[PDB]
Amino acid sequence: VTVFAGPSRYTPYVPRPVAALDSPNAIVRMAKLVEALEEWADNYEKRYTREYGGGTVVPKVAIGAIRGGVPYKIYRFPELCSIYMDIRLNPDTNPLVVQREVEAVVSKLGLKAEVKPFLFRRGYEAQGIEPLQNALEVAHREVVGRPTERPGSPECSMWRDTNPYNELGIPSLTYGCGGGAGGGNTYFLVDDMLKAAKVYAMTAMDLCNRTP
Amino acid sequence: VTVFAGPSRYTPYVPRPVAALDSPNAIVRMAKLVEALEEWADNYEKRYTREYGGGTVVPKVAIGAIRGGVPYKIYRFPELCSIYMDIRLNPDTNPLVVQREVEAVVSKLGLKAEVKPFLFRRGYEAQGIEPLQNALEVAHREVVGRPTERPGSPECSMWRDTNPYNELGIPSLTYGCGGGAGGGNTYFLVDDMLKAAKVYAMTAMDLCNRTP
Amino acid sequence: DVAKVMKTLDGMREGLIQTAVELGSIEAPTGREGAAGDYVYEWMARNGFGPERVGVFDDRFNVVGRLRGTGGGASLSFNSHLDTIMAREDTARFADANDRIYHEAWHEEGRIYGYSVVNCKGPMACWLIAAKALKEAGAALKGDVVLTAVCGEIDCEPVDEFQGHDYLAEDIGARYAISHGAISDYALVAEATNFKPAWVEAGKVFLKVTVFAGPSRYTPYVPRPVAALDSPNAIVRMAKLVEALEEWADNYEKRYTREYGGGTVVPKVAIGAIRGGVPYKIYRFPELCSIYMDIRLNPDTNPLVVQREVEAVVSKLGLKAEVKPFLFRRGYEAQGIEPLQNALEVAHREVVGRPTERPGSPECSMWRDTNPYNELGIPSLTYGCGGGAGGGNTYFLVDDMLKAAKVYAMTAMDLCNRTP
Amino acid sequence: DVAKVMKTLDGMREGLIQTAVELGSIEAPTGREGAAGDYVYEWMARNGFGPERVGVFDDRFNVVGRLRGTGGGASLSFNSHLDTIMAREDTARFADANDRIYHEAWHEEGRIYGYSVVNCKGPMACWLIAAKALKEAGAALKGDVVLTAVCGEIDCEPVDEFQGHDYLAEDIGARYAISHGAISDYALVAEATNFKPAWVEAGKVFLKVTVFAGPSRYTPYVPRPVAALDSPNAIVRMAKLVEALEEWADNYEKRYTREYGGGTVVPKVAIGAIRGGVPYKIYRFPELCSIYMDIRLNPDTNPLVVQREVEAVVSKLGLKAEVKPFLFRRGYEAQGIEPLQNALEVAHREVVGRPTERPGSPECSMWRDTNPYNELGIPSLTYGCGGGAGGGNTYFLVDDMLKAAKVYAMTAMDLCNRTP
């Protein structure tokens, strides 16, 4: 999201006082627009939460980076400042909507900006997963000793290389021991990891002996 | 000015809703700190305005640059964000004070930040400037046709290479045709340019034939 | 409005030809699309479409530019590829690799000549111009028109010892541009369909069939006579295996023909390359020989099946071989295509003068960059003038090319002024 | 508190010595300070002062690190320079350019030897250690202690054909470090003053006096006899002009001696270099000869005056010459020095055991990096053990160095806990 302001002025000629939303310094308007987007983000996850067979998708937002002007010539404030946002999508949201949504958040503040997407990937739910799920479940119950439970929403609202498999029709699910790095956990238990090897192994022996 | 927050989290795990000033994302707190500093800036110029024989110094402030995180890895918001500020000083202000002021503005918000100065230069008023002032004036009156008038506050509140000369005891003043580029003007009138050449010349003929 | 732009296009009839030949003359085989990409970039910049370079490599990249719209309308993407089929020296595949047709373009009469024009600068020139006509005629559109010129459209794929920058194609192609921002509500891929639109294309799977034999012997010790299928020389067994696969191939297209809304998909097979032993040490025949097969897939076939099928052909001959797949792509039928189909149809009827007819099965059974869009939820179909280069046509009629530019234009005006 | 830190310093006396020799041993003539800066950077980093490299060039830079304080107190700057006077091969200026003393450092007895230790790693070693003591003894400071180690302290200046990276010194030196963030409320420059503090130093102006004669003649045609002052050989007239200037030099210091609060400034003159013609084509005497003079200035002398004086000395001999200044720096007396002066004085009395006395005139009549601090409004004075290298002393007493470290530490404890 790049927001335009201006005109640039040598610091000695900068006009004050001025309202933030009307600053010529685009960093200032960006300060306002950043706070607007933060509230939109709070609602975005709630509005776009979706329940799927595979799990429940809570798609969150974050502003990963900011940069306006250059640190080595600051005598003139910048006529434009940009932010880079990471917006997750449930498998059924079209990125053009979300763009149009953020375009809206901008329009509501009366700001002029360029909302341009530089990344798009699709999220998937596995189809035809039953054979793997079942093989997985039998092994898990044998080794872990109890039924498998629904995963936490974050683990279903991120990127895992299951999306490429599913994208290409290879049913895929994600499963392993320990707690997620994004959380973030910092260690694994040798016993769990040893179990996980047992489960993988057993899953393979069941499934690989089923005829497609 | 670098403001600290955290901890970083993979976007699927970012916690909301949270107050701007308590955000884990340092870009968000910076958003708040920018708006506080903008008001401080509004007052800074009024308080530190100083009238001198040479001119009236109205020292302004501007945020020339901002940057937090990097545009090519935004999946994790940054635990710190930075802004680069350009603060002008009248010839009589000690920069350590201004740092402490900005340090204070940060403390009023309960933020943790590092305020560090990476440039300091001094502004000067000419002493013993009279001979040149007088020589200039006669030439000006002869060519332009009227007395010289007080310069605008911006032209006395910037950086010009008069400061080095005065710093080293070579009395110096600044004078030329057209209006300041920071203003910003985009052209010169050739007649004006021709007049300025005569004044420079006459000033020289006057001043250079006086014994120091 | 529509008549304003139509008349405008006739204003640029020469410009249409010039951009086509100028583009067509650039040597741009897959692996060297860079010079052509650079040309389109300047053309795009020169006309105020404000392009960007999206690519994995600094000499192989896609060009994305767009004609901004007033706001709140559907956005339509226009797409064509920079690369061309034949390298300057492709003596490996063509008996006369030096024909003028393979590497140049020229206006010899009301037609434009050049394989590099049919595939694919003729169509790219058509819509490159239509964006020009719309902008210059100040047409009213609420939605953006995205101008995507891509690389690596053609089916060159790295295999074995050929990996990396020189051999990549569709992986760094349009699917890259889209995945990195070149998205719209709909997308029309401009290629030669003979003014018949198609919204289905085929996937593909490439198999490297390697057959084992032996043992190798210095030529003076080679044992004969021996039955072909029992030969120690793997080139010999491969000869037998090649004939079996040729028949399997004959049936494959028949068994797997499937009818779709987008077209009727006839999936064909071909043995694209063969190689066993090395030409510079032939004193010992080789214990193994390989072939590389190109098998198309209709949108509903799973490649693992086909692998098992070809694996079967081998097992029936009592041969031992290794069937390993080194490429897999999926074909799609457009979903939610109707707005574009309709928008397209109205223009077609107005300009060409009759309804659209079903595309030929070859045009529905190949790879076109509609599959990436559809893969990513951008309803996409393919339509352009002329007959397919794979056919292979060697020219375009400037009149046909002009019409197609009009159809591109009129479609944009219709569709871009509809709300999604 | 004070006793805690004192016992600590006796804890690091060997580290005090090791740091000096290790530092003294590094070959770091002006122009090659890089190796030593790197040493200090790592030393500073190792001890948590979180250093930074401030410099114009990546091999000639200053190191600024700081011992952070609790808050709301005055901040004190400690300064010393990285470079040393003599390069390894300085056969031009020294009769025995190979003396062990000029280029190494060693612990031969309760004293440390080496021109590179006296000037100036002995003092740098002192306060570097003092900072270590405070941090390690967890002493309480409300204000930061800034550790500034700089390059280009020594009076090497580019001239004529000697320009650029190799010949630059103080322009890229401490004044650079300060103008780019190494600012404090007060600053103490640690150099050998003999435990006497001085807060005034002298300016300087460098003149290149070139005298013209002629016309050139091949030696066999040189005209003799001729009076010296009328000689065609410019080296001969210069011989006369050198003796006139030497007599002017004797008087200059007497006339311009000035007494200041910080000290008594006795500004001397010297002819540092001469050169006329070239050693590899001597068959023709030269039509011009040059000398390079180093003239010190009290803070109140205008460099333009001294030039006219020397121009005059030339005119009185009826010589025609070109007097042009190629360096001008200003000398300053500290203003607002009282807080540091007192803070210093108290520590001195406690450790040295008697009141401080006025410094020797040379130590107030030189260039020290106090001028840059004072120029920019940071009150600064210089104090350290031993006698000046220009003298030149060749060693330090490990006891005195330990005392100096105690004084630095105590000064910091006092001064840093005052609110500005």
Ligand SMILES: Nc1ccc([N+](=O)[O-])cc1C(=O)O
């Ligand atoms: N797939 C992942 C991608 C990124 C991160 N992260 O913390 O940035 C974590 C995971 C994960 O698997 O937990």
Ligand SMILES: Nc1ccc([N+](=O)[O-])cc1C(=O)O
């Ligand atoms: N000294 C100056 C420095 C910068 C700028 N500027 O507008 O970028 C202008 C001036 C000026 O002299 O007006």
Ligand SMILES: Nc1ccc([N+](=O)[O-])cc1C(=O)O
């Ligand atoms: N997409 C294509 C890919 C390859 C070839 N070819 O003949 O090399 C033609 C087409 C085409 O568009 O007709």
Ligand SMILES: Nc1ccc([N+](=O)[O-])cc1C(=O)O
């Ligand atoms: N600052 C100095 C600069 C140069 C010399 N020297 O003798 O060459 C000595 C000192 C000194 O501090 O004594």
